[PDB]
Amino acid sequence: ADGVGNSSGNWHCDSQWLGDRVITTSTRTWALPTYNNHLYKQISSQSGATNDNHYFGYSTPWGYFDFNRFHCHFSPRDWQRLINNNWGFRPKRLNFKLFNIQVK
Amino acid sequence: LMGGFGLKHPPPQIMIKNTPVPANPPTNFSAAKFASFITQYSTGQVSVEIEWELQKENSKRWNPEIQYTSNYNKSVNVDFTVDTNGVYSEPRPIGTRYLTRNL
Numbered sequence: 001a002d003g004v005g006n007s008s009g010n011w012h013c014d015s016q017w018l019g020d021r022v023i024t025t026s027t028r029t030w031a032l033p034t035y036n037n038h039l040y041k042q043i044s045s046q047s048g049a050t051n052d053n054h055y056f057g058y059s060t061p062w063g064y065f066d067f068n069r070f071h072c073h074f075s076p077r078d079w080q081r082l083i084n085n086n087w088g089f090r091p092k093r094l095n096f097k098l099f100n101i102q103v104k
Numbered sequence: 105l106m107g108g109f110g111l112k113h114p115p116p117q118i119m120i121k122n123t124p125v126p127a128n129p130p131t132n133f134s135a136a137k138f139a140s141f142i143t144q145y146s147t148g149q150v151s152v153e154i155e156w157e158l159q160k161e162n163s164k165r166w167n168p169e170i171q172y173t174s175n176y177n178k179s180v181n182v183d184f185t186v187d188t189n190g191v192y193s194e195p196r197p198i199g200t201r202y203l204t205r206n207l
């Protein structure tokens with residue numbers, strides 16, 4: 001409930017260290033094309049590939065977001081703090097946002 | 105100018121000595137001072153507990169800062185450790201300045 005002239009979010013990239021826990025935020029800009037003309041297409045390995053390399057599947061117009069790499073969430077300095085001072089770390093909870101959408 | 109914290113009221117001086125114990129006095133009074141003492145020494149335990157206040161790094165620096173690290177390569181002796189004969193040794197002086205701040 002904003003409209004054309006109101007930004008729907010703000011840029012938060014910071015990391016903050018509470019010393020029991022660390023909260024790392026990453027804000028990035030993205031661009032989504034139109035994949036394969038809005039079509040679900042089946043895809044399969046070309047005949048003549050080796051037996052081991054055959055596959056069968058489906059390609060979709062949808063895109064997706066993956067943050068699964070570490071450096072997404074950590075700067076090299078924030079990574080240095082973690083690995084130097086700590087015997088272990090695990091993720092607790094995450095929060096995800098999409099905002100300031102533009103369709104051209 | 106050697107380093108550290110200039111203090112107008114520095115930690116006080118703790119003084120200690122062994123109370124004199126005379127040896128056997130003569131049996132006839134003499135006002136001369138005793139030169140004759142029982143040879144003795146004392147030993148014991150001493151504890152010092154200081155509470156140091158810290159100032160944390162707030163930096164936004166992107167790239168990794170220098171840290172003080174031990175060499176990974178193998179060696180006959182380990183640094184900051186006793187040797188085969190039991191002698192503790194410090195191989196190098198270690199300053200406190202590694203982390204970086206802007207002016």
Ligand SMILES: Nc1ncnc2c1ncn2[C@H]1C[C@H](O)[C@@H](COP(=O)(O)O)O1
Nearest residue numbers: 105106107108109110111112113114159
């Ligand atoms: N080592 C040391 N001991 C005592 N006084 C010092 C020392 N170095 C500088 N000063 C003086 C001169 C500084 O401008 C001021 C900072 O005090 P501030 O506490 O930062 O307000 O204190």
